[PDB]
Design a protein around this ligand. Structure first.
Ligand SMILES: Cc1cc(=O)n(C2CCNCC2)nc1-c1ccncc1
Length: 121
């Protein structure tokens, strides 16, 4: 376990670009990390965005978030993929939240950003 609740990370999931996240406890499993069905470690993350979403992400697809300018370094891990405008606008919102979160303590971030989960009736 390298990440704890409230840690800021970048996550690379499916078709999406590296995305700013906050590690959090899964509302059902009450853990922020687990070993998956293939025996690999995963972390539970909240994606910063105007659209709250969460996911379990494989540890190899998670990186410590040091700042928005680290994005170029992640791509370096000349040819470049373009990015759709709608997705870029959502990513810019997520980054603005991540940058604000970076200036907070882990306790302040947990209070400010942890999602509220409502059971579907
Ligand atoms: C980056 C990203 C990766 C991902 O796998 N998902 C899924 C989460 C679960 N629901 C279906 C999308 N959403 C996002 C995302 C994108 C923009 N705003 C919020 C979240």
């Amino acid at each position: 376990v390298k990440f704890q609740v409230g840690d800021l990370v970048w996550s690379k999931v499916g078709t999406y670009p590296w995305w700013p996240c906050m590690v959090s406890s899964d509302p059902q499993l009450e853990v922020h990390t687990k070993i998956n069905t293939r025996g690999a470690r995963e972390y539970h993350v909240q994606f910063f965005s105007n659209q709250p979403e969460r996911a379990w992400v494989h540890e190899k697809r998670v990186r410590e978030y040091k700042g928005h300018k680290q994005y170029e370094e992640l791509l370096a891990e000349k040819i470049r993929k373009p990015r759709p405008q709608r997705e870029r606008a959502q990513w810019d919102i997520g980054i603005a939240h991540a940058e604000k979160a970076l200036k907070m303590t882990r306790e302040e971030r947990i209070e400010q950003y942890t999602f509220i989960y409502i059971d579907k009736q």
